């Protein structure tokens, strides 16, 4: 029922690593401050996403048992989760509580950033469905770890080794769901259910980026490796 001393140690360690990320307020203050052109926003995106990959590699390396896994499986896990992790992180920031009108302005500024209409609705639909779970910082941190350590990712040679690392994180999240939401015993499965809608973003990330209303889609050598653009 309650977290064991080992699980509490694990949760605090995941939290410290997750807190090493770019501050959510810094990101929203910039978007809310002034409206930018589609070219300016594409460049902001390119810089934010490059930094995110760097932070994600550091977060991943600290995941218990990750560095004991086969090197090629390590690359396969990172490539498989990078885009999902950025959308989960973007979903977290989008649902952070702000003063009156700010969230409507944030949404309107993102809606006009340059992305094609085709991708705006599937994106805000995912963000709002994330918000309905009223997730805590710990739930976001554990879900990111769970997303990274997915055994059913393509090109993984040893699934069972990945399975063994994901299982203790799934147990910690399950216990937190029961503690944080005792009235709703469905909460854990609802949280896991959101991972399938996250997976759909991998199929159309490349198009979502190429369809951006800009004359030239210039990416960084790190984004070219992780995104396949």
């Amino acid at each position: 029922m309650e977290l064991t001393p080992d699980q509490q140690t694990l949760l605090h360690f995941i939290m410290d690593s997750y807190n090493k990320q770019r501050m959510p307020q810094e990101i929203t203050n910039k978007i809310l401050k002034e409206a930018f052109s589609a070219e300016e926003n594409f460049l902001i995106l390119t810089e934010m996403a490059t930094n995110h990959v760097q932070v994600l590699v550091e977060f991943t390396k600290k995941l218990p048992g990750f560095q004991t896994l086969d090197h090629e499986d390590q690359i396969a896990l990172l490539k498989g989760s990078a885009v999902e992790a950025m959308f989960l992180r973007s979903a977290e920031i989008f649902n952070k509580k702000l003063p009156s009108g700010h969230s409507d302005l944030l949404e309107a500024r993102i809606r006009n950033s340059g992305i094609s209409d085709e991708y705006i609705t599937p994106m805000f639909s995912f963000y709002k469905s994330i918000g309905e779970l009223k997730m805590t910082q710990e739930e976001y941190a554990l879900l990111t770890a769970i997303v990274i350590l997915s055994p059913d990712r393509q090109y993984i040679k040893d699934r069972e080794a990945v399975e063994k690392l994901q299982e203790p994180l799934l147990d910690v999240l399950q216990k937190l769901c029961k503690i944080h939401q005792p009235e709703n015993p469905q909460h854990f499965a609802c949280l896991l259910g959101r991972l399938t809608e996250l997976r759909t973003f991998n199929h159309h990330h490349a198009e979502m980026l190429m369809s951006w209303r800009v004359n030239d889609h210039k990416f960084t050598p790190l984004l070219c490796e992780i995104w396949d653009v």
Binding site: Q54, H71, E225, I226
Partner: peptide, 11 residues
């Protein structure tokens, strides 16, 4: 193939 990713991983 994934040179930068591998580099950041093996650091």
């Amino acid at each position: 193939d994934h040179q930068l990713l591998r580099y950041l991983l093996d650091k």
